[PDB]
């Protein structure tokens, strides 16, 4: 720009120059490889790999690296990258978004940085919107990479875990956004390490980021799994439980523990015919429902903790006495209560795992992406991904004619106009392309065309290969192509035979989309590098975009001023009002994504601890140390509840504690009055922990010295996985229940944070506790084999924008 | 922590270790300086300065640097910093928040990093909440810095611009948050460079960040200036204007220009007795109101552009036809219209400049801060300032007794209880401190004390010196001190003579504050490094904190369960409900700050361009180049309006354009039909610009070859400053008008963004335009002296939370 205002381009002007000097350094040495041999060239990679091992940086080798690649492509494809393509490659390397207008060779450009980053062998995921472009690029682009001696994998959902492990093994992997994600998810549900298919997330070059990081990021990736109609269990448990009432089934006050352990309920229990006394089989599974419906009666009173209703069982906020929006009790206790109060026990499907693209891609050591339309959403890339948009220069000056939107007062009038323009160009040999926005809009015009007798093709996005075919020849003389929302994005339309003189392509936008970015992509399709073209947009006062801006007043000045008469109009002021309309929409959607991410941030911080721990567990040569560590933490919690805020030291009720530990961590008479006496809550922990150590040792030599290792692993996993999947479901439930009754003037998010976290802390205590109770008092029988907690089949999906 | 949950401390655990190894490297070489000479030691600085010049990094010299300092302090103060103080110093250096509990020597600790960062001579601002602690620290801490041979400045508002320039000159500057800010503001309003008092913002070590970056950051820094009852002008202009109606006072259609230039209104104009024809005096000032009320009549029609009302003149959104919330017309055009439609012309005070602390401190190359309470607001520091809170270990294990809040059913009952506890300890020699939260609460207890005959002192924050005195002896035997919201924060209470055996201090919190952080600071006051203490908090069901949580239900279980009977209660569950109460509040306030910043972000991006340009102008040896550049941009805009979206090339209306330029940039017959003909809008710009060049040259040799330089500077400033101050006011107006009628489902912020920006673009065009019109057709008379645009006196302030 000219004048004062030119400074909003200074940080972009200083950067784009680093990049111009650099691309010049790269062109400077075309000679250094130009005349060389194919094999001398491949040795470069090795030379670099070594050079790096010795201590160089990807940045140092950048120029040469790009040179080598620049060379490799000409040899392999016959294209020697332009100085602009070089500039883009660098942007990508620097971790930014390469905004390189449609037709600049983004595919090829990706190779430069892809290669340079791959060298370390850390891996590089090149990502795309669909399985077609993935395979296409991996094939075409693989040749260049392979030629310079690099492995190239392709990930598809149609591949075995083994096939995937293979593809991720490569120095470079191509795949869809969805595939990547789901794998990362499945990857953290795995029972044995070797089942994971992914390698630590290094660097992702996202092809068409706008579509990926923005469009397909309005919702999250979820993984569901239904519950096996298990109602018979709960009801049964519920029923049985209310039999054993006695102090010979121990409850708690200072703790809230329904201890079944009594031979009344340990005998009268197996009387429910629990295949006798199988503890590791049953106790893990069955004994879990007992202890639930056991507590459901004893610890959870009707109108003090919860409330019954025609809308099921609700919780009550103590101290406020409110109805906890969308919150349930952990570990199926909610269902046990429903059974105790006879209510319909809901057996819905669970969300076993979730992450949002935002949080996913944010996970790589480095991210970069490319596209022809991005400056539009720069605030978002800078905000959410810390990626600055760099608008790369065009190879050849753009010379396409972009036409100001023509306004109409009616749809059918508008449409009929679109249909004529098509004809005009068709009756000239010019190839036209019309962009609709909805399936209906496309067939409409199609029929308008067949009536008028104009040969055409229609794209309604199905098996992208077939359309990609159609679209490439969509630039010939008899070209008349109809695109429903850019159906063939990625495949470029090259200027037809003899078509040059007929003008350019001339695209026709039937209407305008919510996002400029998109109708700007439509524009993009013509002028492929200095080519001529005409981009005409058509608009009507009755378009949804219009009748959503609150533009009735204007639909009236038209009418009231006899305007629908002169019909074809071009008011800078109405068009500027369209853009603002678009800006408002885009922003609303941004606000949406911002909120989605925010809610998932509570989850990410939680995933961090769980995912990291779960992994830690699955690599356990020396597991026990954690176990004891968790048992010590579990134990300390007891001691603390029994030695509250200084409430008279050795007058703490040092007997119930004794009785508890005794029958919680050990087996009856083990710990007694005397032992724990006149000692700080601290001293006690060690003494008492020491006997848990002692007993643990005893267990290592009496039931299998190293099977214990996997026993540990088995249990710690059963625990972890069961508690977590549950919580996550509870969290996905709450995230969408909390938005119901929130007069607290607090932004609901904070509630989800606080409640979400609270819950989490509980779960940890549960895990830590379950682990401790089992690693002590549980008994082995046949096979100590790790077992899946997911019941039946799973389902990996992304929800439609709701 | 123990068990699974311990991982939320991993990134803090990995960092705090870097810091422990380091403090050990520093203690390792105590010998290398221990026995050395005072002068050999000061040479270290030089040695370092040189070492750095040669190419070292502050990080390399860190250990030694800290060593030298460690040494310098013992010599100068008699305190050899502990390993924890060393750890904190590093945190600060690394750009984080040092959370070092009250009584750990944060003051001293600051010296280590302060020094190491000062070396480059780039400067280091050490900041505080009040003028007292500033001077205090600069005095006490200056000695160490000066001793190692460094200059130390102290900034106060009581200092001349010369005195301030002096203080900022130092290698280190101490001052208040407010002072810093306002100076930065005033600094960008300066007429001549040498008037600025600040040096490029290098590094700021914020003492008590929580209070600074959070508490005192709920509102922004504003600078007001009233308008000199100038109503007579406008009315007059308005009046006069409607006389000259003719086509001999030229208006515009394709442009919207009321061109006074006609000798009708250039003669009949000076007839208003404009001291004849003084153009640079009058034209800049007076001719500005004419051209306003001139356009007010011709270009702005009543119910098409705006609307009259009992609430004054409003604008209308075209295309939507809505009432633009809180928006005014630029450059006083709003006032000219009011005069044309006779309405009350408002002459309010203007906001000449603004910035928020958030955006201010975010401006340093590096920021760091220290305090005893920060982990509370970690999410905010990490969010807004990218500063992670590092909780530094305590020198000696903490052994103070923190007591669980005691609950009461009544205030007067509660208070009476506070008054007795005081007595109990007083009747023991223990020194007690009671923290109130409001002025009223403090006198209340004061009277409760005098009645009960207990000698005490009360602090109600006034001339901090006097209180700082009181507070230090507040740890002696007969100590009984009353603090209204931590009145003496910073000065530490050392454990009284013989007081050790009497227990500790024993603080008593009369109530709890909105933020834990604060009642946690209250707690902080005792246990000063392994000292004993008792922190008792007192609470009542009728405290504002309570009767704001929606806790009436609970005020009823008490009553309904005969609870106000046993009165002194300790329910973990009600106390946990207090904290959550606090958490909600803190968050609401955070949400507040987040919104404040967000709105100012639209302003910052704008400040960037203006502030940077304005500066660029005030360093103008070679100004003209920008000028022409802005004239060329101004001119291009005409040409574009006269050659719209391809509307029939040489059928553009190439005559009105001619007529315009002719009488806008040049002086009548200069440019004509022929000249501009058959040329692209591009070609035209150059030709026509060339004649502006030609004429500009002519002006450089006919009115003073180098006075022109300052003429340029003069005008470019008049323009810039007038347009900007206005806009800013308009922006501060809108930011608080937009929150009125916004059913657009859009978050209002986006509107402010879009409208805010729109306005800005206009202003630039105005500046660029005004500059161009003057640098051509304006005439010099006596003195071409830069002149202030601020009328009368100014006022620098921060608004109370509204």
Swiss-Prot record, chains A, B:
Q: How is the cofactor bound?
A: May bind 1 zinc ion per subunit.
> Carries keyword Transport?
yes
Co-factor requirement: Zn(2+)
State the top-level EC class: translocase
- Which is one Gene Ontology cellular component term of this protein? cytoplasm
The EC number(s) given in the record are: 7.4.2.8
Report the subcellular localization.
Cell membrane; Cytoplasm; Membrane raft
InterPro entries xref list: Helicase_ATP-bd, Helicase_C-like, P-loop_NTPase, SEC_C_motif, SecA, SecA_CS, SecA_DEAD, SecA_motor_DEAD
Keyword terms, alphabetized: ATP-binding, Cell membrane, Cytoplasm, Membrane, Metal-binding, Nucleotide-binding, Protein transport, Translocase, Translocation, Transport, Zinc
UniProt membrane topology term? Peripheral membrane protein
UniProt GO BP:
intracellular protein transmembrane transport; protein import; protein targeting; protein transport by the Sec complex
| Stretch list, region Disordered | 786-802
Q: How does it assemble?
A: Part of the essential Sec protein translocation apparatus which comprises SecA, SecYEG and auxiliary proteins SecDF. Other proteins may be involved. Monomer and many different homodimers can be isolated, some of which are not formed in the presence of a synthetic signal peptide. A single SecA monomer interacts with SecY in the channel. Only shows some colocalization with FloA or FloT membrane assemblies.
Family classification: Belongs to the SecA family.
Name the chain's protein.
Protein translocase subunit SecA
Taxonomy of origin reads: Bacteria, Bacillati, Bacillota, Bacilli, Bacillales
